[PDB]
């Protein structure tokens, strides 16, 4: 059902994006080559609430699922409310392997 998402590898320095879906590319206006290997915080900007960023950081540290809403920015500077859902992905041994993040732009752009 989920069309905008990325997968990150927390076993690599700074938990970089290793896969971005076409929907994510379309939402954010970036090309794959522009975002593969980067941490997803490039979506954040001036009006992104630091309290919420902290909550994300905590859930990642604790390796648990969370959902937050925060201001993000497309490549051209456009703001949207991202309802962001994060899910840890463990391997067959129960060791953290990836995180999946699903982005939903809850902003009516009519
Ligand atoms: C899988 C995944 C997807 C993420 N997607 C977003 C996102 O869409 N927008 C956003 O602002 N942060 C996103 N983040 C959060 C940032 O990557 C980072 O974890 C957050 O800013 C907290 O860490 P920091 O204080 O080092 O910046 C995502 C994190 C993960 C693991």
From Swiss-Prot:
The modification S-4a-FMN cysteine is found at residue 40. Autophosphorylated in response to blue light irradiation. 2 molecules of FMN bind covalently to cysteines after exposure to blue light and are reversed in the dark. Residues 1-63 form the PAS domain. Expressed in leaves, stems and flowers, and to a lower extent in roots. Present in guard cells (at protein level). The flavoproteins improved LOV (iLOVs) are fluorescent flavoproteins engineered from PHOT2 by improving its photostability and brighteness, and which maybe used as oxygen-independent fluorescent reporters with a small size. The iLOVs are PHOT2 fragments (385-496) and contain many amino-acid substitutions relative to cv. Columbia, to confer different properties in term of stablity, brightness and color. Induction: Light fluence rate-dependent induction, independent of light quality. It is found in: Cell membrane. Disruption phenotype: Plants lacking both PHOT1 and PHOT2 have curled downward leaves missing color changes and lower petiole angles in response to weak or strong blue light (BL). Impaired proton H(+) pumping associated with altered increased ATP hydrolysis and absence of binding between 14-3-3 protein and H(+)-ATPase (e.g. AHA1 and AHA2) in response to BL in guard cells of plants missing PHOT1 and PHOT2. Residues 64-110 form the PAC domain. FMN 2 binds at residues 39, 41, 44, 57, 72, 82, 84, 103. Protein kinase that acts as a blue light photoreceptor in a signal-transduction pathway for photo-induced movements. Triggers the phosphorylation of AHA1 and AHA2 C-terminal penultimate Thr in guard cells to activate them and induce stomatal opening in response to blue light (BL). Also phosphorylates BLUS1, a kinase involved in stomatal opening. Mediates calcium spiking of extra- and intracellular origins in response to blue light. Involved in hypocotyl phototropism. Belongs to the protein kinase superfamily. AGC Ser/Thr protein kinase family. Homodimer. Interacts with PKS1, PKS2, RPT3 and PHOT1. Associates with CBC1 and CBC2. Binds to BHP. Undergoes a photocycle characterized by fluorescence and absorption changes induced by blue light. Half-time of photoproduct formation is 11 seconds and 15 seconds for dark regeneration. The activation loop within the kinase domain is the target of phosphorylation. The PAS (PER-ARNT-SIM) domains are required for the binding of FMN chromophores. This is Phototropin-2. It comes from Arabidopsis thaliana. The chain holds residues 387 to 496 of 915 of the full protein.
